[PDB]
């Protein structure tokens, strides 16, 4: 829902979505190749 939303807000009015009470399948993130920048701070991406 967050990644494939058709409309994204502007940077000055950035939209914030809270994600909780769910199981997070990160495999879609690694499988996706459209991503150009993937930097993680304070956590190993393989350890996510």
């Amino acid at each position, epitope marked *: 829902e967050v990644f494939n939303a058709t409309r994204f807000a502007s940077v000055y009015a950035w939209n914030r979505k809270r994600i909780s009470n769910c199981v997070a399948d990160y*495999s879609v993130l690694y499988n996706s190749a459209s991503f150009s920048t*993937f*930097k*993680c*701070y304070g956590v190993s991406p393989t350890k996510l």
Partner: antibody
Amino acid sequence: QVQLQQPGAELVKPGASVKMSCKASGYTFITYWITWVKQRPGQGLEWIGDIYPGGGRTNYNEKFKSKATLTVDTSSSTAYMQLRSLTSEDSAVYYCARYDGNYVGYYYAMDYWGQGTSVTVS
Amino acid sequence: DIVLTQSPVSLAVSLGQRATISCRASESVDFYGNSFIYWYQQKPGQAPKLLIYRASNLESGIPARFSGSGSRTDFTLTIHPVEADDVATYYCQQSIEDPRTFGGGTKLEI
């Protein structure tokens, strides 16, 4: 363009502390992580820790968590590594270098390396 | 801690021949089709220079003779042809999980 400069050699008495400088130039210093790798003469390479100049976030190896303390100087674009409780086994060559850390890119690929500094503990 | 073993410890290869350096991982390195194994060349008295990243991609500026291969817990670095200036120690590094470790190194002799 991109240059990482280190002193040729450093001499420190056993049990003392030594401070290190890794001057960075030719690139945006705060956008690239800096790490230090220990190489004993005649041995392989050993990771010490990872630090991000932007915000000062630090990651330390469990073996070197109490031996090495890592700081940054964004004003001078210089990375600082401090070793305490130096002993005879700490005499090695440490290299400072930068990686882009992009998962869909190089990730932990370490393209460029600093010249390194050798320390004699006696 | 993933332990990387490099064989052979010393390799002698003449001009125009093929040199293969194999790095064995104690644990799996592949992660969703990505193998986090890096190859470096360290000339004596100099810092290591990156050759292969992700165990399959050649770094820019490196001659096409250097090539990487392997998957799962076994990876090999192939140099063909081998030139005179190839005398150095080659190290393999893994980055799937912390702490990142380096192999014992393979010394190449002409």
